[PDB]
Structure 1
Amino acid sequence: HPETLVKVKDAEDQLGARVGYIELDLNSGKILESFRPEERFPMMSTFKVLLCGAVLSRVDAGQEQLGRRIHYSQNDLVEYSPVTEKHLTDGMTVRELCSAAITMSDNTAANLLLTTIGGPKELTAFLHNMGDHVTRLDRYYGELNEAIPNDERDTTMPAAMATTLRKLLTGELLTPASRQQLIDWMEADKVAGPLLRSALPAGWFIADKSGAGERGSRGIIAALGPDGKPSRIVVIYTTGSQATMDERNRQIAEIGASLIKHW
């Protein structure tokens, strides 16, 4: 994808930052194009799809129920909890929490779900067991941040994330009902408008999950395709930029425009 590669390198120039990129054939798993595929990037909230995949594996095993209600308190609430802050007395069901984590990127929802699966170390072990020996989650939201140079915690690599997302969405790990639920949550993503969705023509399918973080981090993982059916996985990460969120958004959208134009 010569033009898209040019645009990815342009984005590094514009942002003064690293950009990692991969296009993966959804059906075959073949890497169609990549840039920095085996470099680490902060996952940010894109991990929340993997989290809910682990939750769904427990549901499939009969060890979790999507309808199970979890109660929590003010003390559980961390920064950016737009859905969970509304239900301190209601509690929320496991499916409501995964909906909040994926579609709104609610951080308390993610923490609560992490607890159900045994925490970050257990998510990492889940990933390792499905053949992703790179992606790692280490911390809950709200934990003390060390500010470590080239911090390896809570990171993935574009190729690993793309491969892992394909396994979760189409592989045999989850039941088809659970695969469908996971992609349905991603399709209902509410907070990724200015990224790939902004470049998406009418009639296209997209299921995605966005991320942002300090130090200029911004990213998106997606399954998308024309005619209302996904056919490709796209993963885009950037970190290190001093640019505003708008500027990072625009570069990702422009990579998206290139992806679409040269589909």
Structure 2
Amino acid sequence: HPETLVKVKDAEDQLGARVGYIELDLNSGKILESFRPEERFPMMGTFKVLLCGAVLSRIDAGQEQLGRRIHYSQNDLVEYSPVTEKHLTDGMTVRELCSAAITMSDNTAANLLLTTIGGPKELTAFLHNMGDHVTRLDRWEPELNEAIPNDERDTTMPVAMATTLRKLLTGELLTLASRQQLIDWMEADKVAGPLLRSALPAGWFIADKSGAGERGSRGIIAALGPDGKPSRIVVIYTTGSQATMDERNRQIAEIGASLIKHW
């Protein structure tokens, strides 16, 4: 709805920053609404979804096991590792690392997973292999959040991220069982509450993943819909703002409210 683009516009106003926005039909994949859809934005933590899709892909092909245990040391910890911090001693399984990266935004788990698959370049080739020639990962956590202006490293475009997400969750690239595991981790969010979830009506589905970076970078990807099932994909990125975290959350929440209200 154009009333939503009015809201997106206002948010750029308020934040004094670029907002990238897209709304995509899950079923048809058609573009419903857009705003800067082919501009680049840093992914920040929203890459972790893609990352665990690649892992799941390996597990579907027999080259990885969800139950495999990964051991690491205090040397591996990066800033913000709620879950990995706690299990230095005994290690964690692949399942538990994907759960922590996605449900708790644990930075070390992402790094450990990135290692297991061959690094940023391997993720990028995975993405390329499925038709996403725009999205690219170049660094590890936490340097991939630097958000240097005009830098193409670790960026995507709203359109590219959206259609890639669609494929992860509806195409034949992943087994049914793997796909649902993904949605399950995303549906279990503990950090994205003051974003889209705070405007979502009762009974609606949402599976999401948010990101934060330097230089006022904030972002979120999600699949949402009424009556308990996803109907569309929404992607919102922003960067270059001097606004506080809470004012950045509010505007994204307001974009959410207007999209739901004009559903």
State the TM-score, normalized to the length of structure 1: 0.98
* Structure 1: gaps of 5 or more residues: none
User: Counterpart of 2:145 in 1: which secondary structure?
Assistant: coil
* Cα deviation, residue 144, structure 1: 9.1
- Counterparts in 2 of 1:50 and 1:147: CA distance versus 1, 3 Å: closer
- Counterparts in 2 of 1:2 and 1:99: CA distance versus 1, 3 Å: same
- Counterparts in 2 of 1:96 and 1:160: CA distance versus 1, 3 Å: same
Paired residues in the alignment total 263
- Counterparts in 2 of 1:5 and 1:114: CA distance versus 1, 3 Å: same
- Counterparts in 2 of 1:136 and 1:208: CA distance versus 1, 3 Å: same
- Counterparts in 2 of 1:90 and 1:78: CA distance versus 1, 3 Å: same
On the 8 A contact 2:42/2:147 being kept in 1, the answer is no
* Cα deviation, residue 143, structure 1: 4.4
- Counterparts in 2 of 1:143 and 1:258: CA distance versus 1, 3 Å: closer
User: Counterpart of 1:144 in 2: which secondary structure?
Assistant: helix
- Counterparts in 2 of 1:261 and 1:44: CA distance versus 1, 3 Å: same
- Counterparts in 2 of 1:96 and 1:12: CA distance versus 1, 3 Å: same
Q: Distance in 1 between matches of 2:43 and 2:82?
A: 21
Q: Distance in 2 between matches of 1:255 and 1:144?
A: 26
Instruction: Quote the residue 1:115 is aligned against.
Output: 115
User: Counterpart of 2:62 in 1: which secondary structure?
Assistant: coil
Q: Distance in 2 between matches of 1:145 and 1:65?
A: 29
Q: Say yes or no: does 1:37 pair with 2:37.
A: yes
Identity percentage of aligned residues: 97
- Counterparts in 2 of 1:42 and 1:148: CA distance versus 1, 3 Å: closer
- Counterparts in 2 of 1:19 and 1:84: CA distance versus 1, 3 Å: same
1:233-253: per-residue Cα shift (whole Å, max 9, x none)?
000000000000000100000
* Cα deviation, residue 146, structure 1: 7.6
* Cα deviation, residue 151, structure 1: 1.2
* Cα deviation, residue 26, structure 1: 0.4
* Cα deviation, residue 189, structure 1: 1.2
* Cα deviation, residue 117, structure 1: 0.7
Q: Distance in 1 between matches of 2:32 and 2:93?
A: 39
- Counterparts in 2 of 1:52 and 1:158: CA distance versus 1, 3 Å: same
Q: Which runs of 4+ in 1 moved over 3 A?
A: 142-149
* Structure 2: gaps of 5 or more residues: none
* Cα deviation, residue 149, structure 1: 3.5
Q: Distance in 2 between matches of 1:24 and 1:249?
A: 22
1:144-195: per-residue Cα shift (whole Å, max 9, x none)?
9887441111000000000000000111100011110011000001100000
Instruction: Quote the residue 1:93 is aligned against.
Output: 93
On the 8 A contact 2:146/2:215 being kept in 1, the answer is no
CA RMSD, 1 decimal:
1.2
On the 8 A contact 2:145/2:212 being kept in 1, the answer is no
Q: Distance in 2 between matches of 1:17 and 1:48?
A: 24
Alignment of 1:189-208 (within 5 A): 189-208=189-208
138-147 or 31-40: which moved more? 138-147
* Cα deviation, residue 90, structure 1: 1.4
1:214-251: per-residue Cα shift (whole Å, max 9, x none)?
00000000000001111100000000000000001000
Q: Distance in 2 between matches of 1:193 and 1:80?
A: 18
On the 8 A contact 2:120/2:137 being kept in 1, the answer is yes
* Cα deviation, residue 142, structure 1: 3.8
- Counterparts in 2 of 1:35 and 1:146: CA distance versus 1, 3 Å: closer
Q: Say yes or no: does 1:58 pair with 2:58.
A: yes
Instruction: Quote the residue 2:69 is aligned against.
Output: 69
On the 8 A contact 2:44/2:145 being kept in 1, the answer is no
1:51-90: per-residue Cα shift (whole Å, max 9, x none)?
0000000000000000000000000000000000000001
1:19-70: per-residue Cα shift (whole Å, max 9, x none)?
0000000011111111000000000000000000000000000000000000
